[PDB]
Amino acid sequence: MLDTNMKTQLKAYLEKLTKPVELIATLDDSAKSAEIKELLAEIAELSDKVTFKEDNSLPVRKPSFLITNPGSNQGPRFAGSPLGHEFTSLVLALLWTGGHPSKEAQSLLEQIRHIDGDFEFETYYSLSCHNCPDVVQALNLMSVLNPRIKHTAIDGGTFQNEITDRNVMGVPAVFVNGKEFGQGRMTLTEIVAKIDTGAEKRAAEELNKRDAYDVLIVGSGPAGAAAAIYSARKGIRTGLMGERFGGQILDTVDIENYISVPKTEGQKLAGALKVHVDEYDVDVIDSQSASKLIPAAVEGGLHQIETASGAVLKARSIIVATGAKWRNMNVPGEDQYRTKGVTYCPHCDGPLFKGKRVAVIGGGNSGVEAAIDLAGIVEHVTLLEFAPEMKADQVLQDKLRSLKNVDIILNAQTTEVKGDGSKVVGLEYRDRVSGDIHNIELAGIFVQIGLLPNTNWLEGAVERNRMGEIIIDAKCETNVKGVFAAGDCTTVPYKQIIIATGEGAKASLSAFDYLIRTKTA
């Protein structure tokens, strides 16, 4: 039923065929199926690539024909007339199946080439309908790429029997596996979204496709936030990846040394940090953990960060700001009284305990200094050391034995934090030697047993001191060109919010200075 106009175009279009096409028909003696025999044999006669065969004992509609390459039995199936408005749908099916490429976004085409679900699409059309080809062609494309996605386009003029049995007022009308899909306009892009609803949001593929960063900051505590703002203000492409925006301050409650702010709160300062950040062009990535730094193999090239989610980001410059974790005792009641008397930092919370009795857990330098600190502010201090002797510098140990409101207890293992449901009221411990249990009444417990920088993921790539801290010069420079670090994760002598924010800003200005110096062409 091809008109001469269609023939000439079709002859011209089949000249753009690089693979051999076969049309496999299933026909039933009716004059409609005779009309489709004629057509297939007309088309076959127009090209040496195109062969018309027929197999009339297949479990598919009659009349219909599979378009395919030799051997393989995968491709678009038309039932009834592939003419009218669907003429250009038919040329396209032959072309694609014969090696011509899709004229649309190849990213989607790969996405489609990899899909797991088994889908038969059967679209219902009729020859008169103007808006039906775009849906037909769409789902045609799909059937060629992935062999799991089958597609039968159905002319309503030939199957009024199926039009009624299954209600179809209005075409086009598609039916994914004997189930209503959708009607009217649908672009391929739009089709593929809905089909992969039970998709799997590969946000790691989102991340892998991003452009290189001018600076990528790893860690979104105070240090990294501060660095993100200073970087964004220079207008450079800036990224800020971290596990949890706000770092340590988020789990903090009463904060009284953020300079200029007599009293604030962790959740609030963290929100204030997020607001300042969003005042600038900063791609904030949350809930994402860095697992490896790969240093650029040449100056002027790019460093890489690997995430635990399997993504890889790329940056002209990196800033590490991943902080530290204070070690816990891991005893009953420790959790329960976190921020209600059990604390870590003596700098931050010391003043809250004037007049009160406290304990320091840990006999290292950090614990011993902490006790000499608290001793001046508070009424009584009890230091408890797990080992049979204190580890701290002698100078400090003698100074602590000099004060009149302090007790040292050796071989003392804290077993329980006690409180009243609201606040700490005491401590239980055992003598690791005789096994004897003991009780202290107090209002505060300062755990000073070790800081652990979050840097074991950097082993081998940047240099660390012997406590795990990232070694930095005054400019926050690491031993790798174009990698800087700021905050508690580094060798800064002290760990405070106000100190960490200053270092992030430094690291940012140092990173910018390195970008502008990276030479020329």
Ligand X SMILES: NC(=O)c1ccc[n+]([C@@H]2O[C@H](COP(=O)([O-])OP(=O)(O)OC[C@H]3O[C@@H](n4cnc5c(N)ncnc54)[C@H](O)[C@@H]3O)[C@@H](O)[C@H]2O)c1
**284 annotated as a binding-site residue:** no
Q: Does position 449 bind ligand X by CB under 6 A?
A: yes
Tokens of 258: 């953020």
Q: Which stretch binds a copy of itself (CB under 8 A): 177-185, 290-298, 435-443, 505-513?
A: 505-513
DSSP 471: P
Q: Measured between alpha carbons, how far is residue 126 from residues 82, 86, 173, 351 in Å?
A: 9, 9, 10, 83
The 8 Å CB, 24+ separation contacts for 34-37 are 35/1, 35/63, 35/81, 36/63, 36/64, 36/65, 36/80, 36/81
Site for ligand FAD in 298-327 (CB under 6 A): 321-323, 326
Strand partners, 430: 413, 437
385 binds, among ligand X, a copy of itself, ligand FAD, none (CB under 5 to 8 A by kind): ligand X
CB 307 within 8 A of CB 286: no
| Residue 441, phi then psi, degrees to nearest 5 | -90, 125
247: left (phi over 0), alpha (psi -120 to 50) or beta: left
Site for a copy of itself in 353-412 (CB under 8 A): 369, 372-373, 376-377, 395-396, 398-399, 402
Q: Does position 386 bind ligand X by CB under 6 A?
A: yes
Tokens of 314: 């790329």
**368 annotated as a binding-site residue:** yes
Q: Does position 50 bind ligand X by CB under 6 A?
A: no
State how far the Cα of 106 lies from the Cα of 192, in Å rounded to an integer.
Answer: 13
Site for ligand FAD in 195-214 (CB under 6 A): none
Q: Which stretch binds a copy of itself (CB under 8 A): 72-80, 160-168, 268-276, 430-438?
A: 268-276
Least CB distance to a copy of itself at residue 419 (A): 25
Amino acid at 39: L
Site for a copy of itself in 472-501 (CB under 8 A): 474-475, 491-494, 496, 498-501
367 binds, among ligand FAD, a copy of itself, ligand X, none (CB under 5 to 8 A by kind): ligand X
Q: Is the peptide bond before 63 cis (omega within 30 degrees of 0)?
A: yes
**478 annotated as a binding-site residue:** yes
Nearest alpha carbon to residue 207 among 277, 285, 114? 285
Strand duo 451-453 + 324-326: pairing:
antiparallel
Contacts with ligand FAD by CB under 6 A lie at 218-224, 241-244, 247-249, 252, 255, 257, 289-290, 321-323, 326, 344-345, 348, 454, 457, 487-488, 495-498, 500
Contacts with a copy of itself by CB under 8 A lie at 222, 225-226, 229-230, 233-236, 257-262, 269, 272-273, 275-276, 279, 347, 350-351, 369, 372-373, 376-377, 395-396, 398-399, 402, 474-475, 491-494, 496, 498-506, 509-510, 512-513, 516-517, 519-520
